[PDB]
Design a binder for these strands. Structure first.
Lengths: 263, 263, 263, 263
DNA sequence: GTAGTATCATCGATAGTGATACTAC
DNA sequence: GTAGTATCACTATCGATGATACTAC
């Protein structure tokens, strides 16, 4: 069928409907002029000229340039195979590009390939105010703790965390507890003081320090001192995850720690 | 350069702008929820979902069997290599489809191409556009050559037509082949060698000649010369069937041939 | 009016409708949360979250990351001014790009710059049949002649050509007329023999030549000898414009021409 | 080449695919009718007309009164130079519009920013995304500085804020500026350099310090550090107003400051 | 109606950009 | 209701491609 011939030329050889109908006509009728083509095909008369001129450049037709151009079809066995061979050459190029593209992309993404898995995760700063949320955040910090826990506490933070502190120490994370001397009686026969006497965690006391902090593996949790709101459980507290910043606080802690006294 | 990565992905790996961005984001942050992606990247918030699902579908990102709100990138080393290997398969199959379409067309058109003889005949001049289409006519010249074949190849007059030349030589056609010296390197790597050294034909090389041509019996094929035309793959080539015109060109060929090397 | 404020932010500072309404809201109400933003603006509740996060990256808002994020507007005098200067630097870049682009384009188009103006067009091959069109083409050739006219004629002239040959010769174009001896008596009172004797043009006679031709300034006009379409007279004739081809015929003409004379 | 030209034209000179091609064709063949263009080029025949008219309008081609429709290219040296010069004009006017839109917005928002005193106040921690937006906060820090300013600039903490620094010094704020040695070579003249020799401030250079910062009274501004974040212009910067936290950072500054050179 | 010129119209893919639906409290 | 989530629908550009005037007769 000519319908089938037209379909195939469109589907596999990059000819539009009109160009395809034209080339079939040229093959069926041999030599045609734009005028003749129109009479023996469904190619619109107005379009015959450019459509045939289109087959010309694509290699499906040869031509005689004159007052009225006449066209002959190239032999389908020559052009169709030519098309395929050329196509394969394009493919062969598009392929090599893809490989060089791949090689380069891997070189570009080299520095970015990240094994670490974010748990929050794009967030490295978190602002907490309530007493509920301040505890839920310390809980997470102690749970995700894998290396060291440094706790300089002015009050309830260390007494309420005891359950969570113990569990962490059990996993093998180095724990250092630093309290204000006035808070000691709050730890009567507590499992912390028990662990401290065993050697499973370091415990020390200081009369005072101005910047209490919780440190967990490059995570620091501190408060913005407001005694006004500190009565109001709505005291602002900040969680920051960064090697540099947390390292700055760790220095301060070590300053405290090297001046305190173990129980 | 994130921009270069996005560019490459869009070009050689069939990702849209957003998907390309999303993948680099995925590769960068290791894990991302749709909202997180909308934040750190330039992918429209409302598009992050379909963009991420799309990447997953294209095998560029994965979702855990758990709460599927988080997406992780597939490692570039794996995903990029897999795309290229898979792509080769898709093209290879399209090749088969194309070949099947060609063979079918040749079959469908068989009845059309009968001894007429043929539908296009008695025409002694045709024009062919583009040096790339040179062989679409010269092939016919070689298949019908009965007496003599005189080729002064520029490297495009009779590309990949060697089989027809040796076939012509077999049916008793005298063949003189004149090549530019830069062509010889692909006779290694030939079939006319050892068909030339056998004496079944002649082969001579030459540094420079201004009028490359193919003569077959009383037919001459030559290309015109226009810088602008060739930039647009539109160079004009002419086929003339005339004993006087051919004879003139043959005088020029002979001129070239008496200066060529017997190599 | 806020409508006016929103209009300006969209028009000049690259904010969509929602982001623009948000920043106006933030400026009006100071600190807002996504929920609050919705209550005091026409920003859809579902969109507030991502829209505010958008103003964040764009530099129109600062934020407190928490269970419920709160946002403050950057001061319009800082952001709006910041935007403009940043924009100016992008412009400064796109400009430098444009200049380099131009420089390169001029280097690429250097070989392509065409001064000559085609009076026929892209066609360097023309196929003519009949006497009407072959004469109109010879006339055009003689009119456009500016350097030399080489005419080896097998018959005709002054078949309308005396007038055109003379007029050309009047313009100062070197003319060479070559007729077959049998044609000499046809021009005994012709203006050509008159001009030849003066001699404003060279005239010579030959008993025979197999390839008559008209040459005009790198244009050649010849016939494809067909027994006996010349009688019909549907004899195919070809016009070719090309230095190489025309030089080939010119060599042939000189072969003829070196065999005089007009007498 | 031709593909590269088309690429440039589309990129830097605001031509669509067809117009860019058409222009290169116009430059190549010197003159072209819509049909001729449709033939030699990849511009769809039915589109050649509007495409050529378009090129003319954009000042890339010119047309004769007819009767035929032939187009000539404008010389690239002229058209390309004209586009760029005109473009500079176009942007320069949009800049004015932007400045005018800004000035108006500040006016419209003036009533909004009334004595609250600050719309946003009593807030002691804010986050700012992207190093590019650093000054959108630090600016406020410097303009409100009453006692002390300690800058350890990385080159982005206080970009283009020199005027505010010298201005702060005038109202009696003690100013210490610590810069990396690679920054100093670009401080010419400047007001910050002949303010130190005058003694109105101090300036010390240092090869390397890990924690660039800005301290103003009881306020600190510092940036976190994440490669992935910075690739997406999403780096987190923090502003904290707390005497204990700032004092800590100040200890670090003083550490940096005791190793720098007086320049 | 016929030749040959110039001109329009429909559509898919992509990327923006102004809005809803579903859902567990 | 509240606070989220998960998608929707629409617009504009453009390059592809099929159809249709106008002007000669």
């Amino acid at each position: 069928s000519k319908d089938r011939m037209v379909e195939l030329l469109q589907e596999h050889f990059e000819l539009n409907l009109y160009e395809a109908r034209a080339y079939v006509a040229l093959v069926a009728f041999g030599v045609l002029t734009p005028a003749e083509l129109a009479s023996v095909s469904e190619v619109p008369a107005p379009r015959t000229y450019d459509v045939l001129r289109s087959l010309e450049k694509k290699g499906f037709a040869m031509t005689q340039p004159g007052k009225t151009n006449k066209y002959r079809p190239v032999h389908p066995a020559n052009v169709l195979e030519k098309f395929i061979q050329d196509w394969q050459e394009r493919v062969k190029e598009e392929l090599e590009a893809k490989k060089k593209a791949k090689e380069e992309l891997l070189e570009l993404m080299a520095p970015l390939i990240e094994t670490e898995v974010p748990k929050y995760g794009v967030e490295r700063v978190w602002v907490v105010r309530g007493i509920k949320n301040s505890t839920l955040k310390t809980k997470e910090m102690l749970e995700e703790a894998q290396n060291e826990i440094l706790l300089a506490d002015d009050g309830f933070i260390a007494v309420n965390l005891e359950d969570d502190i113990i569990k962490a120490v059990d996993r093998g994370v180095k724990t250092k507890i630093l309290l204000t001397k006035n808070l000691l009686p709050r730890l009567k026969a507590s499992k912390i003081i028990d662990y401290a006497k065993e050697g499973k965690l370091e415990l020390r006391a200081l009369d005072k320090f101005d910047l209490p902090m919780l440190i967990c593996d490059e995570e620091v949790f501190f408060a913005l001192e407001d005694l006004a709101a500190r009565y109001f459980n709505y005291e602002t507290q900040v969680w920051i995850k960064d090697h540099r910043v947390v390292a700055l606080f760790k220095e301060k802690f070590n300053e405290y720690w090297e001046k305190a006294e173990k129980v």
